[model samples]
Target chain A: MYNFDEIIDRDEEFIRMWVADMEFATPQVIIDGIKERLDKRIFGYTKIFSNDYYNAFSDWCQRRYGWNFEKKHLVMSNGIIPALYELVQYICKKDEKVLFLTPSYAYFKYAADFSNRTPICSDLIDNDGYYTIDFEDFEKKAADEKTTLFILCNPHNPTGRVWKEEELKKLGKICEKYDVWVISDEIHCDLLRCDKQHIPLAKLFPNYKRIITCMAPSKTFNLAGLMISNVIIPDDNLREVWLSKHYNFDNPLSVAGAQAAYEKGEDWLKELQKYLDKNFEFTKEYLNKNLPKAKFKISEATYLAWVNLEEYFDKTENLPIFFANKAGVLLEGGNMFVQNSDCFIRLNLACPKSILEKGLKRICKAVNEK
Target chain B: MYNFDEIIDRRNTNAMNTDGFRSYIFHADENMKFPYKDEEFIRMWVADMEFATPQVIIDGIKERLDKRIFGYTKIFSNDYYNAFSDWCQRRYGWNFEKKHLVMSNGIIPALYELVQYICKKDEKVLFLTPSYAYFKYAADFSNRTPICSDLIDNDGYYTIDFEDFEKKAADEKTTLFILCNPHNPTGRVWKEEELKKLGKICEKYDVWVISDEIHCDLLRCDKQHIPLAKLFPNYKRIITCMAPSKTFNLAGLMISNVIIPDDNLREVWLSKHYNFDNPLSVAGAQAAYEKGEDWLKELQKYLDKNFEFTKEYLNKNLPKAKFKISEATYLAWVNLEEYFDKTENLPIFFANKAGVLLEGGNMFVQNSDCFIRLNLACPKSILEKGLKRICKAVNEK
Candidate 1:
C-alpha cells in the first residue's frame, strides 16, 4: 500500500544522508492525529495526565518486544540526547567517570563531557565488516570504582549491531558487579531487519533498578522534529530527581502524534522495514560491482551501513568533504564518531532506492577518481 | 473577522488551565471534592485566554502539515528572525540584532537556566514583591537566595519604591534582577522614566537584568510598554525575553525568544541549553507575529471593556473593596481585605463560596495579602457571572 520508490523532492543543495532521520514522510495516521489536536485551537500549558497515553505506549511495547514496564516508571523527555545530559548529572557525582563502547555515538561522550565527568571508552573489535565487544576492556573500565554510569546503544549506531542476548547478559553482569547504572538507548530497536529481534536491556534484568531504557517512535515513524521520547526509569531515586528537576511539560500535538504512532503506525513500519532491506541489498551489490575494494556489510539493525574506505583513502584524508565536493553526496565520515574510527564512512540507506542507487554510484565514482 | 465573545470548550484538552487546577492550585488528587463541580466553576485562574487561537495561526500549522515531513529540523534559515524582528520594530519601534537572538522553550525555563549560568551559589537574585512566583522559584531551584523589594502599594495603585529597589540592587551578592514588563499581578506598564531609573541602579551595581516582556503585547488600549534594554542600549548585561504564549495562547507550543546581548552568556546558553525548535511551533509563532495583529487589536478592545466592567461592579456592589482598571494585562487585581480576614485563604474562599477559581495573594511570593488576581480574558457573560458570585459571597460573609 505504501510507495517506497517515489523520490520526494527536498529543496536542498545535495543528497542529505548525514542526518540520522529518514528521508520518508511521516505516516498519515500521525499527521491526522496532530491535525486533530490542532482543531482544539488552544495550545496552552499541557501535561499528559490520562491513562490512554500510557496504555497506548505500554501495549506497543508488550506486543513488539514482550517487555512491559510499570506505568509509574515511565516519564517523557524532549529527546533521548537531552535525557542523557540530565541522567548523567543526576546519576554521577563531580569526580565519577562514564563508560561506553567506542566507534560510538558522539553525544554519549558529550553528555559526560558537558557535565565534567570523565568518559572511558572500550573500542569494539572489528573483523573486516562485523563488529564485536572487547569484553575484557569493558569489564576493566566498568571495574573502576569511580565509573558509575554506562550508556549503551542497542542496535548500536554507525556500526549497526543488534546485540545478542548473551552479549547483553555479559554487559549487564559487569555493570551489576560494579554497581554501575546503565542508560540503554533503544531508539533504533524497532527499525531492525525483518528476521532480527531486539531485547530490551531492562527486560533481562527485571529486578535491577538501575537500568533506564530510552525508546522513541521518532526513528521508526520519522517524528524526530516533533521532539518526543519515552524514558523508562525503574529506580526510585533517579526518577525522583528527574521529576523534581526536569522541565515537565510536553507539546500537546507532539503527544498526539506520538500516541497515534504507538497505537496505529505498525503497518507502515512493517512496509518500511521491507523497503529498507531491499535498499541495503541494492547498496551492497552496487558497492561490490563498482568499488570492489570497499569493505561493507548489511547492518542487522538500523539503516546505516558502516563502509570501510581505508583501501581507497588515507587515514588523514577527509572523506565527507571529498564526497560532497567531488560527487555531491553528503555522508558522515568515521571522524564524526568518537575514537577508534578512521578511514570509514557511515552511509544512511533510509532513502528511496533511486536515491540510494545514485548516492552509491556517485560515491564509487568519487573514490575511483581519487 | 475574530470572535472574542465565543467560549471555546477546553475540557479533556490537557490544558493546565482547565484540567490541572486540582494538582497545581490545590495540591490535591482526584478525591479532593469541592462544593462546585469541575464543569460548573468559573475559571479565572490561569493566564491563558478563553478564546480560540487566531485562524491564521491554525492555517499556518495546516500549511506545515501539507509539507508532509517532520524530520529532524532546526532553524537553518533567517525567515523566523526576520518575521520576529519586523514585529518588534513595528510594535515597539525597537529592533535587536538577529545574531543575538536565541530560541527557548519558555521564558521561565530560560530564567532557570540563565540564573545558574549568570550567578554563583553565593550570589543572589532580586525582584519586586507581588512578583510572578516563578522568578523566586527559579532562583531557589538553583540554590541562590532571592531578595524581594516590595512594590509600594498606595491604596490599589502599585509603584516601585526606587530607594528600596536600589538598596537591594546595591548588595554585592544580588547579581541578577528579573524585571517583569507590563508587570503581572498589579499590571503596571512601567513608564520610560521609571525604567531608566531601575536600569541605572542595575548598571551602577553591574547587576544583570532579565526583562520578561511576555505581557507586553497584551496591554490596555493606550498603554505602551518600554523594554528596559531599549533604555540602556549599550549595556551588555541586559537580557530581554518575549513570547506569544500569553498573547496568543500558545504556551503548550513551547516557544519563546530570549535575546542575550552578552557574548559570554550567549555562548554558555548555546552550549548548555537544550537548543531546538519544534517545526510546527515555528510556523504558529511566525504566523502569530506576521498575521495576528488585527485579531490582537480586537482582543485588546474586549479586554479593555472587561476591565471596565470589573471596576464598575466592585465599585457598586462592594464599595469597600479596592480595585483599579489596570494599565496593562488582562488580569484584574482586587483587594478584598475589607470583606475577609487576613488569615482566610482567598482562593479557597472563592472556590467554595463563589464557585470561581482564582489566584490569591499567597501565590504571588510576598507583600500581597487579601488580594486576588482574576483573569479577565473571558467572555463578558462569564465575567459577569463570576463578578456576581464573588460580590454575593462577600456580602453574605
Candidate 2:
C-alpha cells in the first residue's frame, strides 16, 4: 500500500542505494503508532524499563523464530552499536580481543576500540561467488588467549551470506572451546527470502551460555532513525553485568515505532521480503544482460547487493569514487568490508526498481566507456 | 498567549509527566493500587514542566513526520547548530561557536558519557550537596568516587562555601566537579560574584567543571541567570551543559547540548559521539530554540505566581514549613524541620497525607531529611489544590 517516487538530492541528484535504510516509507502500522504517541501531547521522561516495551519484541521473536526466552533475558539498548560497545567493555578486559569475520560491518571492529579491546578479524574466504568462512583460521584466532569476544554477523552485511545451521554450530562450539563469547548481530535475519531460514546461533545450543544475540526491527522495518535495539543474553551473569553498565536511554517515540513495527508488522515484512527478492532477481538479470564484464551474484539476505567489478576496473583506481565521478552513481566500494573489497562495490537494492535500474545503468556506462 | 489557568487532567498521566506512570504501567496486570489511590493525588515528582510544549516544536515534529523516512540521520547539521548558537548568543549574550556545541542524547546520558570519558580508574568526582541526584549516580555508574561538599543553606538561601569547595577541589584524585547552575530542588541561582569565586578555585586546582545550566532559562525574581562559562571565558575546563527540554517541556525527546570550549576536551567528547541527533528531536529542538522566547517568558511568570501562592500558604497555615520563594526554576524547596524532624520521611508523609508527591531531601545528598521539593510548573489550580491539601495535612497533625 506504501509507494514513493520522490527523488532524494545528494550531490547532483544521486539516488541513495549505499546507505542501509530502505527507500520505501515505513509501513502505515508503524507510522500510525508514532502518530498515536504524538497525540499524548506531553513528551516527558518515559520509562524504558517496562513490560510493554520488552514483550513486543519478545513475542515477535517467539512467533517468527520460535525462540522462547524470558523478557528478563532481554536488555534495552539505545541502538545495536551502543549496546555492543558497552558489552565489549563489560565482557572483555583491557587489551583483550573481540573477533569478527572481515568484509563484515565496520562498526563491530570500531566498537572494540571504543570499549578498549583490540579488534581481531578473520577474513571470510571468497570461493568465486559464494563466501565461506576460513574455519581453520577462525578456530585458530578464537583459541588465542588474547581473543575474548567473537562478533558473528548473521545474514552477514555487504556479502549477505546467510550461514547454514551446521556452520553456526561449528562456530558456536569453537567459541565455547576458547572461552570467547559471541555477540550475534541478527538485525537482517528478518529480511531473508521465502525459502531461506535464519537459524539463530543461540538456539543451536541451549547449554552454551556465551551467546548474546543482537536483534532490531530497525533494519527490517526501515526505522534506523529511531535508535532502539534489543540485546538478548542467555546467561544470567552476563545479562546482569551488561545491565549494570547500561546507563543509556532511548527516545520513547522509538519504543512506539519499534513496538508497532514488531507487533503489527508481520504481514508488511512478508510483502517487503517478497518485494526485495524480486529486486535481487532483477539486478542479477539486468547486470548479466547490460554489463557482462561485471561479475555478480544474488545475495541471500539484506538489501545490499555485493558485486565483483575487478574485470572492468584497474586495481589501483577507486571503484566507488570512480562510479561517482564517471558513472554519477554513488555506491560503497569493496574496500569498506574486510581485507578483500578492492574489486567490489556493494549496491543497495531496497529502492524502487526504476531507481535501481538508473543506478545500474550509470555504473554500466562508466565501466563500458573506459 | 499562554494562559496557564487551564488544568492538565492527569488521572492517567503521560509517561513523561508523572513518576506514578511507572507504578501505573508496572503493576497494570496485578491491578495494584497505589497508597494514595483514593485521594486526588497531584504529582510533583517528575522534573518536567506540566505545560504543553511550544506549538512551534510540535509543528516542527509533525512537519518532519510528513517526510516519512526514519533513516539514519547526520546530526551535525547547519540548522541545529545555527539555531542553538543563536539561542545561546541571544539568551545569555555568550557568542558560542557551533564547534563548541556537541549534540548529546540527553543530560543524564551525557553525564554518564562524560564521566566515562574523563575519569580514569577510581578517580573522584566532587559535587556540591543538595544537588541533582543523577550527579551522584552518574559518578557511581562510572566507578568514580563521589565526594560531596555540602552547600550552606541559610534561611532557604543557598551559598557555596569557597573554603570547603577549594578543599574538595584540592584532592589530587578529584578529576571533575559538577556545578548545578540555578541549582535543582533549591532553585538558588548563583550570583556573578559567587560564580567568579568558583571559576578561580577551579582554575587554581585545574579541576574540570560541568556547569549544568538546564534551568538557566527558567529564571524568576527578575534575576538574569548567569551562564557560568560566561564569567570565566579564559578557563578551558568549563563544560556548559544546556538543553531546550526544560525550556520547552520535552523530557521525552532526549536532546541536549554540551558546549566545551577546550579543544582537547571537545575532541574527547566528540570521539565518543555516536550520532545521538534523532530527526524528531532535532526538529523539535531546532524549532524551540528558534521561536520559543514568548512562550518561555509566559511560563516563567506562571511559575512565579505558583511559587508566590505557595509562599503565602506556608506563612499563613504551616509556620513549620519554611519556604522562601525561589529565584529560578519552577520548583519549591521547603524546609519542614520545624514540623517534622530530620529522621522522618517527609516525601511519604506528604504523599499519604496530602496526596502530593514531591522529591524527598534524602535523594539530594542532603544534610537532613527535613526538606521537600515541590514542582511549581503545573496549572495554578493544581498548585492551589496541592497547597490546600498540604495545609490540611499540617493543621490536622
Candidate 3:
C-alpha cells in the first residue's frame, strides 16, 4: 500500500554531499499547501485569528507526538532560529549570560550574542558514538543567577543526541532552581530517525514558567528558503512577554504550511521518517563496512548527519575545499560551527538513497585521494 | 509602446503579503511602472528590480495576490510570532526583538522612539550623519539627541566613517543609533570588517543599534552585502531595520521592519508601540515579502544598466561634475560641492532654475552643502534630462 521512491531523481547534481535539503523537490504536501495558498490570492497583511491558527497546531501536537499543546500557546515565527533569538531576549537581560549545551547548533550562540548576551556553553561528551550532556556542567551553568536564559536544542543537531525524559526532568529541575527562562528548539522533533523517542524538554517539566518551545517544518519538509517556524509558549504571561518582542508573524503562506503540517502532516511524516530511517541505516552500514575513514551519527530526527573526518582532514578549513572542489558534494564543514572542533562535516542525508550513494561515493573518493 | 501596467500588474495579488516566501516570487514594479496612465512622466522612484524576476516568484505571487480571501495567514497563531525572530537568526544573529515587531508605519517611526525605548532621558541616538537627511525627523520627533557621522570620501563610492563611527559608538552617553544598508546616495556596501568593527564598537560602548536595511535588495552587479545582523550577530546593541517600501518602491505604503532577533531586546522595543500604520500598509507589506522576490531580481539588473547609463552620460556630457554611480539604492549621491562654494542654494537653484528636482546635499546634513542627491529611480529619458540639467546648472553656476 506504499509507493516508495527508494531512489528519487537527483536535483543537487554537479555537487557532492547534500546539506540537509534533498536534491529532490519538496514533497507534494508542501507544494499543495503553497499552491493552495496561491490559488486563493488577495495576498495582503493577515493576522492569525483566534481559531485560524491555534487549532491546527494544537491538533497536530495531539496527533503526532501525543504532546497536547493548547491552541493558545502557539505563536508564529519565520523559523526556529529567529524564535530562539527572540525568546531569549524577551525573557532575559542585556549583558546577561544565557546557557546552552554544546557541541550544539552554532547559531544558538550567535542568537544569544545578537541580544547582547554571551553564550555560556556546556559541551556534550561522546558516550560511545552518540553524544550526551555533562549534567554537572549543565547544572552549574543553569544555576548561575546571571544565567537568566537557557536555549535548549532538543533532539539536537550535528550529533544525533536526544535528551530523554530523565535528562529533561533533570534540566527542568536545574532551570527551576535558578529561575531561568528556557527556549526549547523542537523543530527536529518530527524527524526522529531510529526508534529513539524525541522528547520536549518543557513537557518533561510542565511547571517551568519561564520556558518556551520553538518548532518548524522548514527543515523536515525542506523549505528553508521560505523561512518559517513557530514558538510554543505555555504560560499566558510568558507568552505575552514574547508577544511584545515580535511583530512580523502574519505570514499567511508559511502559516498554511506549518498549520497543515501540524494538522495533516502526521501521515506524511510517518512515510518520510520511514524513508529517512532506511537512509540512515544505509549510511551507517555502508560507512562501517566500506569506507573506514568516513564516520557519521544517524541523526535521531531530521535528515542531517554530523560526520567525523579526523582520519583525513585535520584542520577545519580543509573540509569545505575538499567537499566543494574535490568530492563534488557541497556539504557544510563542521568547523563552520564555532564550538564544533577540527574535522567534522554536516552531511544532508535527507535525499534519495541513489543520491546519498553518489554523495557518499564522492566523499569516499575524496578521502581516499587524500 | 508603454507596458508599465503590465509591470504594476505583477505585484497586485501577491502572497509574500500573506504566505511564507522562500524566494522573491512577487514583482511589485508592474503596479507602479507598467500600469501608470500618468502621461509622459517617467516614473523614477520604483523600488522593484528593473530586470525580469525568477520564474518561481512570478508564478507564486500571481497565484497568491488576487486569489480568494479564504486563505489562512498566521501558520501557527497558537505559537509566538516567528518572522521577527527567524529573520534575526538568519540575517543578523541577534536573538532579540526588543518589542516583538507588532506592526508599523515604517522603520523611521519605530526608531523615532529608540531613545525612549532603550535608554534613560538625555541619552543620545545616531544617524549616519550624512545623506537621507530628510529623515532626521525620525530622531527629532522622538526627542532623541541626533548624532552624525560623515561618510568617508572615495570620490563617488561612500564608505562608513569608521573612525567617527567608533568614537560616537564608544560614547557612553549614546544610547541608540540607526544605519542605512547599501547606504543611500553613496551606494557602497560596507566591507565585512566595517560591519564587525561597528558591532564590536557597539559591544564596547553598550549602545543599541537600529540598522536600516531597506535598500539591501538593491546590491549592484558583482557585489555582495553582508546583512549587518548576520555579520554582527553578537551585537545585542543592534536593532535590524528593513522594509517592503524600499524593496518594491511601495514607500507611500509606509511599511517596514525593526528587526530585533533577540527575544529580550524585541520585548523592549514592542512594549513601546503597536502596529502603527493603517490596514493598507499592513496588507502591502505582507504581499511584498512573501511574493516580491522575482520582481526584485529583475529590477536589480535594470537598475545596474541605469547606473551604467548614468556613468556613460557623465563621462561624455557632465565630465567636470563627476560621480560614482550607485551600486545599490536608487539615489545617486553626487559631488557637486565643488561648484556650490561659489553659489548659494545649489540644489534649489538647480531644481528651480534648471528644472531638475533633486534632494540638496545640505538637506542630509550641514556638511552636504556642496553636494546634491539625485533620485535615479526613473526612466532613461528622464535620467538624461536630469543629468543634462545638472551639467547645465553647474556650468552656469
Candidate 4:
C-alpha cells in the first residue's frame, strides 16, 4: 500500500502472489555485482575451492541468532522444495510416509510423493479465521512407524501464525519420543510484520538432532527469479547422510547470486519491509471498512490474507467463473490447498495498492451480489 | 622445423600461464555484431556467439551421431573409451586399454587436480620445456610445486630428452604427467613412433597420464594427431581428455569429451559429476561433432595460410627474429629466446607496445628463454593485421 502508483496500471488483472516471493527486484548493489561479473566475460567453470559458502551462511546464522555452527554441517540444494525430494530418496525408505501439517505448502506433500515416499496430510483446524493444530491428531499420526519424517512450516502459510517457542518445544518433544525428524522451513521467518516474532523451532529444542532448517534470502529480498536456497543441518552424521544422496552441488549462477545476496542483503531488506508494513496496514483497513461482512485477520507474518468466502459463494465450485466473469478478480481458491475446501480463499495483497483496491472492489461486487 | 621466431617472447614472469589472460583487458562491448541474449551474451569471455559450431556435430546421432532422448548420460567409462578406441584405431591403428582412460574436467580441470589431488603442498608434476602455456596455472597455483622438466632445444626444433623426463619422473609419487599431443602454442603433432618410446618409459614406472587431445583434431586438413593412448593399453589408468570446443571454435560452449574406461573407478568418478549435466552444452556438443569435420578442414586450410603469411610478414616487417609455419594447429609458436629474457613480461609489454592480444611464449612452463604464441585462427584479413601488430609490438619493445 505504500504507493505503487508508478507501476500498478492494470485494474482488471490485479495480482500474482501464488509463490512465496515478492515481485520486486533485488538491490541495485546485487545487480551491480552481476554487472561487474558480466564485464569480465570469462564465465569458465568455477571450482568448489573451499567451504566458503557454508562458512558464510554459518557466520550469518551466528550473527543473526547467536547460534554458532560449523561449516561442515552445511549441505545445499537448488531449492528447499527440491531438497526435500532428494532427502526423501536419500534418508528414508521407499513408501515411508512423510507427514505434513495439512493446508501446508501443498508442494511438500507432492515432494514426498514424487520422491517415492508416501504423503499423509492431516487436517488443521480453522476457528474464526485463525488456523491451529489438533495435538491429539498429530500424535496419533506420528505414532505410525511409517511416519518417519514430519515437515513443519513456521510462521505458517495461509494462516500466517508464527508458532511460539513453547509451542515448538511441545512439537519437538513429540517428535523426539517418536524418533520423527522435522524439516523446519523458516523461509518466511524474516517476513513477520506483527507481534508474532519468528524463532527457529530447533533452537528452542536442541535435543531434536534430526532438525533440518530450510532458509533463503530470496523470499525476503524478492529474488526468487535467481533460484537459490540452502539447507542447514547442524548434525554431522545427518549431513553426511544427506550429502551422500548427491545434491551437495547446485547451479553455479544461483550459488554466486546466493553468496552476494546473503552477505550484503540485510540493509536493503529492512528498507523494503518498511513499505510492506504500510501495505499490510492498508489492506486490513480497507477490508474492515468496506467489506466488514467478509472476515479476515491481517497476516502477522506472510503477505497473505486468508479470507472466509463461505457467505459469498453458496456453491464453492462456481467460484472460478463468478470471480472471473462478474468481478474480474482472480484469487488462489481454498480447494487447491487440500484441507481448506468449501470455505476460504487465499488472497495476495502483495501487489501495488491500486491493483489490490481494484481486486477488492471486484471481490465485493462479486460476493455481495443478489 | 617450423620456426618460432615471433609467436612467443616469454608469456609469464609471474610463473603462471594465466599471463596472457591477465594481459587481455576484455571489453564487454568489444564484440557485438551478435547481440546479447538474456544479458548473458555480454558475459561470454572468449567465445563467439555466431553459433559457428560444425555441421557434423549438429545432426546429432539421428542426424549424424547418437540422438539421445534420455536425459541421463554415462561419462566415457567403457562406452566412452570405445569412442576413443575407435578414434585411436582410425588415427594410429593402435588399440588402447579402455581401463586406462580416466575422465577429467577438461584438460585444465585435471591440471587443477595436478596441483590439488596428486601433488603435495610443494610437490612437482613433470612437464616438457617450451610446453603449452596453460601449464603455468597448474604449477603456479600449486605454488611452484610442479617442477618443470625442461627440454633442451636441438637446432631449432623442440624435443623431449628421454633422460630429462626419466630424472623428473624418478620420484615414486611424481603425481602426474601432462602431455599435450599435437602440442598447443607450438602445433607439434607427435609422431606415433616417437610416442611409443615415451609410452614405454612412462609405463616402466606407474606415472599417470593427463593427455590433452583437445588440439588433436586440429592437426591440419590432411595430418591427424597420433593417438598415444592407442599405442599403449598397458597405461590403462592414464586419463585422456579432449573437446571439440577449440577445433570447432565453439569454446563459448563448453563440452568436455572425456574418456574414462575403468569400470570400478569410473563409477566412483562418475558419482562426482551427477549434479552437473548441462543440456545446452550437450546439445552444442552434438552440433559440434556433426558439423566439425568439414569446418575443421576449412579452418585448418585457413590457418596454414596464416602460418605462411606470418613467416612472410616476419621476414619482411621484423626479420631480427624468426617465425615458424605450424605442423598441426593454427597457433604459430615463435622462438623468442633470442629477443627477451625469462623475466621480461613480453605479452603485457607487447600489448602496451602494440594493440595486439597475442599469447606470449613465457606463458608456457619450463621454456621462457624467448617465445610467443600467436593465434592465426581468425580470417585472413584479420589474421594478417594481428600478426603485423605483433611484429610492430616486438619492434616497439
Candidate 5:
C-alpha cells in the first residue's frame, strides 16, 4: 500500500542520516483512526485524556515494560521537547543549574538555557564500546548547591546505550543523595536492542519522589508530527505545579493518533523493531568489512549508530561535512553533542535497507578513497 | 460530499466537538451528565458549529497521510503564509507581509502568552466587560491585573464605553488593551468610527493594543470586518491576532496567526512563543483557506437564516424576552432579565428546567443575571426547538 524507497526533495542525491524520523510509511491503522475521527467533522476544543486515552497508555506501559502509574500522575504536554522546557522552567529556581549527561539530546541544554537555568553536563565513561555513567562525577555536579534537576536520557541518543538496572539504581541513589530532581526522557525506551531491557528510573526506586518520567508514543509509533507527549509526574504537588505552568493545548488529530498508536500499534511496532534491527546489524557489518577505519560497536538501542571515525578524520567536525560533500551522505556531526563527541559521527539507520546500504557504501567510499 | 445536517454522537469521543463541556469532555463516564439528562440534550452551550467541517479539509488531511512519517515540521511556510495573506486580503482588503506573521497554538493560549510577554507581573491588562471569559482568565493566570471597562449597552446594540476605556487605558499601570472586534457574546461588529475612536485612545495612552479578530470571519456576509491594524499602520504596537479556526471550525487543530507589524516587537514575541506545530493541522488549515470560501459563504447565509428565525420566533411567542440580531457571530444575547429578573444561574435554570442548555450572563463580568448568551450555530429545527422551550420556560415561570 505504501513505499519508502524513493527519495524526496531536499534529501535528493543525498543520504539523509541527520534528522530523527523513520523513512517508513506510518501504519494504515494510525491513518485510518484519524480518518474515522474526521468523519465526526468537529475540530472544536477537546479533552487531552479520555478513558480510552488513559487506558491505552496505561495498558501499554503494563504490557510492554511492566510500569504502572495511576491515572492522576499522568499529564499531557504538547511534545517531549516542549515538556522538557516547561519542566525545567517549573522544577528549577530562577537561574538555577540543571544537570545532564555528556552528548545528550541537544534540546536538553537548549531547554535549560531558554528557561534561564544553567546547564551542567557530566560526561559518561565510554568504556571500550559500552557507555557507562561516571556516577562519582555526577554526584560531584549534583552536589553543586545550584544544581536542582537532572535530565536523564534513557537508552542514550547517538551511543544508543540502554542502561541496565544496576546503572539506573546507582544513578537514582546519587540523585536521591543530592536531592536532585530527575526528569527521565524515555522517548527511546521501546527502541531498545532485542536482548536489552530498559529499567525506568522510577521503576528502580519505587518511592523516588523526585523522578519525573517523560514518555510518548511519538517515537515508538512514528507520530512525532502528532505533537503529544505523556508526562508521568509521581508526586501530587509536582504534578499540580506542572499543570499550573502548562498552558499548551494539543490538536485533536494528534490525540487521535496517539490513542490509536497505543491501543493498536503493538504489532506494528514489533515489525518496525525487527526491520530496524536488521538495518543496524547490516550497517555495522558493512562498516567493519569495507571501511575498517570507521569503528562502530553494535548499538544497544535506537536506530542511530555512534560511529567513531578517529582513524579517518583528525577532528570530528570534518566527518559530517566531508561525508556530505564528498560522499553525498548527511549525518549529525559529533561536535554538536559535546567536546567528548569530537571524534564521533551519529548516523540514522531507520531508513529502508537499500537506502542504508547506499549510505554505508557512500560513507565507505568517501573515507576509503581518501 | 459533506452534509452539515446530520447529528453526530459527541459523547463517544474524548474531545468535545463542543467546548462548554471543558470539564474534561467525557473523560470519565461518571463525570457529571449534561444537566438536562431527562430530555435529549441540545448542545448549543458551546461556541463550535454543529455543522460538519467542509469536505475539502477532510480530503486534505487524508492526502497528507500519504507522506506517512509524522515528524516535527516547519511551523510556518510560504504555503501557510500565502494562504493566510490571501484570505485576509480577500476578506478585509489588507495586505499583510509574510515575514510579519507568527504562528500560535490557539488564540486563548496566545492571549495568555502575550499577557505574560508584554506585561510586568503587577501591570494591568484591559478588555471590555461581558467579554470572552478566557481573556479575563488569561490575564489572571499570567499574573496581570485584569481591568474590565464595561461596554455601554445601548438597547441591544453594544458599543464601547470610550470614556471608561480612556480612563482605564490612561491608568499608569495599564500596559495593554485587548480589543475584541466583532465582539464575542454580544456580537457587535464595530463600525469603522467605533474602531477609530478606540484606536485613537489606545494610541494616546501609549497602551499596546492586541486586536482579537477570531470572530470577524464568522460574521454575516453583508457586514465587513475592519482590521484595526489597518487603521493604525503608523502605530507599531498593534498586534492583530486572527485564526482560521473560528471560520473553518478547527479549534481542535490549534493553529492561529498573530500579525505584528513592528519587526523588533515581533522578534521579542517570537522568543516567548512556543510553537507546537503539527503536519495535519497545517494541511487542514491551508486547504480550508484555499477551497473553503464557498462553504464559508454558505455557512454564513445559513447562520443569517438561523438568527432571523430565532428573532421572529421570540417576537411572536415571548414578547418579554428582549433579543437583538447579532451583527456578527452565531450567538444571540437575550435579555431574559426583564421577565425572570434573575441574573444568577439563568443558564442552569433553562438547562435543568427547560432542557435547553445555554450560557448565562453571570459569567460575563459586566452582565447581569437576566442576560443569556444563546448559540445559534445549529440546525434550524434544533434552534426552533430550543427557542420554543426557552419561551415555554419563561412563560410558565
Candidate 6:
C-alpha cells in the first residue's frame, strides 16, 4: 500500500532537502478524500461545524499517543509557523519576552521578532552529538518577570530529540513555577522511530492551562501544502482572543484531506515510520563509511540528521553554500538555527535512499577534498 | 464542458450557500426553525453560483493531485503569475508588475490587513455607501472610523455623489478609500470618467485607494469594467484586489490576488501577512485564467438571461416594486419600500413569509433601506421559483 523507496521527481535543479516537508507523496487516502470533496462542486465559505473532524483527530491522538483533549479546546491554523507568529503576540506584550531552547527552529525566534517582542534563548547543552536542555538556564530565563511565553519544540527540530517524559515534566514544572505560557509545538511527535513513543506536553501536565499544543499531520502525513493544523488551547481567555482575531474560514478540501489523514492514513504512517527508521540507520552508516569525521547520532524522531562537522571544516566556514555550490546538495547549515549551533549541518533524511546516498556522497566528496 | 442549468445539491458540502445560511444571515443555530422546510427554501442569499464550478478547474486540481505531493509549497515559478497577469491584460487591458502582486485568502481578509497597514487608530477609512458590510467591519476591526459618502439613489439606479465623496476624501484624517468596482448589491460598474473623478479626489487628498475588482469579470454582456489603477498607472497609493473566488465560485479554496503598488505597504504585507497559498487553489486559479474562458462566457450568457427573467417576473407580479436591471454582478437590488415598513427586516420577512433566502439592505452599510439583494446566479428554474415567492409575499403584504 505504501512505497517510501520510490524517489519522486521534483522540478528543482538541486537535491531538494532544505525544507522540512517530506519527499514522500502525501498518502493516497488524503488525495482520494480531497478529490471526493472537489466533486461536491461549490467551494464557498466553510468552517468545521461538525464533530466528525474533531473525532477523527482525537481518535488518532488517543490511539497513537494515549492522549486526548476536550474537543472545545481545538482551534485551527494555516500552519504552525503562522500560529507561532500569532501566538507570540497573543501570549506576550510589547515589553515582554519569549523564551525557547537553542539551537532552535529559526521561526521560534522569528515569531517573537515578528510580534515586536524580545526573544530570550536558553542554549541546550550539546553533549557530543546528543542535545539536552540546560534546565537551570531555561528556568532563570522563564523566571524573568518579562518572559511571559515559552515555545517548546517537542520531538525537536534540527536535532531530532524525541524528548523523554522526564525532560518534558521538568520543562513544564519550570514554566508552571513562573506562570509562563507554553506553546508546545508537537508537529513532529507522530514521526518518531518505531521503538520511540511521544508524550504530549499537555498530556504530562493536564492541569497546566497555559500549555497550548500544536499538532498537525503536515509532518506526519506529508501534507504541509494543505495548510491546516490543530492548535489545542485550553485557556479560555486566549482562545477567545484567537476566535475574535484569527481568520476563521478554512479551505474546504483541506478540511477533508486533513480529516481523512487522521482517520485513514494510520497504516500508511506505520509503514512510513519503518522506512524512515531504516533511512536514519542508512544515513548514520553512510556517514561512518564515507566521512568518518562526520559525527552523527540516529535521531529518535523527525527525518532531519543533525551532524557535527567541526572536524572537517573551520568554525567560520560556510557549509550550506559550500555544499550547494560545490556539491549540488541543498541543506541548512548550523547558522540557520538560532544560536549555540555552529560547525553543524541539518541534513534532511526524509528522501529515498538513492537521493540520500547521492546527497551524502556529494557532501562527503566536497568535504574530503577540502 | 459546462452545464449552467443543472442544479447541484450543496446541502452536505458544508458550503455557506446551502448549509451555513442559518449561522451566517440569521445568526441563529440548528434550533432556529423557519416557516419553510430546510430544503424547501429558495437559497438566493449567498453570492456563489448555484451552478457547478467549471470542469477545467476541477481537471486542473485533478492534474495537480496526480503530481502526488502537497508539501510546504509557495508560488516558486512564474507560471501562476503569467496566467493571472495575462488574464488581467486580456479582460481589463491592465497589467501590474509581478513584484506588486501578493496572495491573500480572500479580499475581505486583505481589506482587514490593509486597513491596519494603511491607517492609524485616529485615521479614517472612506467608502461610498450602500457598501459591502465587510469594508465597514474592516475599518471598525482596525480601530479606524468608517466615513461613508452615501451613493445617491435615484429610484434603484445608484450613483456616487462626487461632491460628498470629494468632501470625505479631503478630510485630513481620511487616509484610505476602498472602492468596490462593479460595486456589490447595487451592481454599478464604474465608468472610466467616474473612476477618474474618484481617483483625482483621492490623489488631491493624498488618500490611499484600495480598488476591489472582485466583480470585474462578472459584468453584464454590454458592460465593461475599468480598473481604477489602469486610469492612473503612476499612482503608487492604489492597491488593487481581484480574485477568481467570486467569478469562478472558488471562495472556499481561499485564494485572491492583491496588487499592492506602494513599496512600504507591500513590505508591511510581506513582513506581517501569512503569505503561503494552497497548491490546488493555485492550480484551479491558473486553469480558470488559462482554459476556463469558454465556460465563463456561457455562464455570463446564462446569468444575463436569469437577470432578464427576474426583471420581467418582478415587473409583472409586484408592479409597485422598483427594480432596475443591474449593469453588472448577478445580484438584483429591488426596492420593496412601498410594501414593507422602513424598520422591517427584509431578509427575515422573506425567509418566513416568502420561503426565499435573500440579503436585506441592512446587510449592506447605510443608505439602503426596505431593499433586498437577490442572487441571480442560479438556473432559470430556481430563479423563477424564488422570484415568484418574493413577489407573492410582497403583494399579499
Q: Report the lDDT of model 3 for residue B322.
A: 62
Highest lDDT model number: 1
Show model 2 residue runs off by greater than 4 Å: A4-10, B9-34, B38-40, B119-123
User: Candidate 4: misplaced stretches above 4 Å?
Assistant: A1-14, A47-52, A235-237, A247-252, A318-321, B1-397
Tell me the native contact fraction for each prediction. Answer: 0.80, 0.70, 0.03, 0.00, 0.84, 0.81
Question: Any idea what lDDT model 6 has?
Answer: 0.89
The window of 10 residues in a row where model 4 chain B has the poorest summed lDDT is: B8-17
Error of 2 at A10 (Å): 6.5
Check candidate 1 and list the clashing pairs. Answer: none
Q: Rank candidates by TM-score, best first.
A: 1, 6, 5, 2, 3, 4
Displacement of the residue A53 alpha carbon in candidate 1, Å: 1.5
The parts of candidate 6 lying over 4 Å away from their true place are A11-13
Error in Å for residue A330 of model 3: 1.8
Candidate 4: deviation at residue B330, Å?
Answer: 11
